[PDB]
Ligand binder design. Sequence first.
Ligand SMILES: OC[C@H]1O[C@H](O)[C@H](O)[C@@H](O)[C@H]1O
Length: 346
Amino acid sequence: MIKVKSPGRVNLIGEHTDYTYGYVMPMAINLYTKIEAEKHGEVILYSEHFGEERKFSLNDLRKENSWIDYVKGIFWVLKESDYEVGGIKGRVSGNLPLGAGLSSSASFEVGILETLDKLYNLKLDSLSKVLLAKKAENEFVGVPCGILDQFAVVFGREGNVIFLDTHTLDYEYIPFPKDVSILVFYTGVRSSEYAERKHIAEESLKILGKGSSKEVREGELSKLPPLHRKFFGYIVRENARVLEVRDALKEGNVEEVGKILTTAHWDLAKNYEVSCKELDFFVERALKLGAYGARLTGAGFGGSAIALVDKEDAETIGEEILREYLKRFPWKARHFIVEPSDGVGI
Ligand SMILES: OC[C@H]1O[C@H](O)[C@H](O)[C@@H](O)[C@H]1O
């Protein structure tokens, strides 16, 4: 029997940049999918979250349109890459909230991959784990996505964020300040919009004749159609913000990091049009209550937001905002205090 702990993730800055091969800056967080498993002739997994067992023969990688598909996708991608692995029997648990925008999918997929890696002695390198998990999500599960989530879940390092160039896959660890906490606020609001943004951005790159948004300047966007232009303007500003945050963090200037996050949030909300009143509420109140800055994290249109706050005030701020929020909105909102953590491991 082995135990794997696979973290979720938050993106600090660099939102809606990965699918144009821009810059991103995620961290793994200390909320986890836990998998405890042993070898078996078929695949049998009990999900604590769903309170149910689902199983399949190794012969059977047919999509079933349930959570088991995330498991099948890893078996599929391993088979497609010429690995021989056998079955597993085990239990999936942990404290990472499902569908909150903290990357339940990548956490789970990478966790299954790591379980198989260890049980079957596959000796996968870290980048292969990221690429296999991404390929499973994209091609088997059928969810478009960039590399952000998988990279964070694998490459996370305690006390550090990851600055990543998603075009080259060059990355560096940047220390995150002591006694600054990440307050995560899940709105209680659990894809077509994402696919549209991705499609428009990819088309814009072709119009511009460029392979990455890193290569694009404000000036060039006049060449794009009005809607392409609006959205791509955000992407260019966002890449610049990632580099600004990198410099500010390397100086320990959390006040500047916070300011940049806030600017980024309103850019997402007003120009990329991917926020909602629930996320905006959290951001505005967190700022009034003393956060250095705040921003939605992940795709938007629900999910979670983050606020950078003094460690000693994180609990009070989360509690005050949650009470206000629940008077205004019907959803089962939750807050968590997280820190930058190590990537997937036993
Ligand atoms: O930054 C937006 C973010 O949206 C989702 O979380 C995707 O899975 C990521 O790859 C990234 O595109």
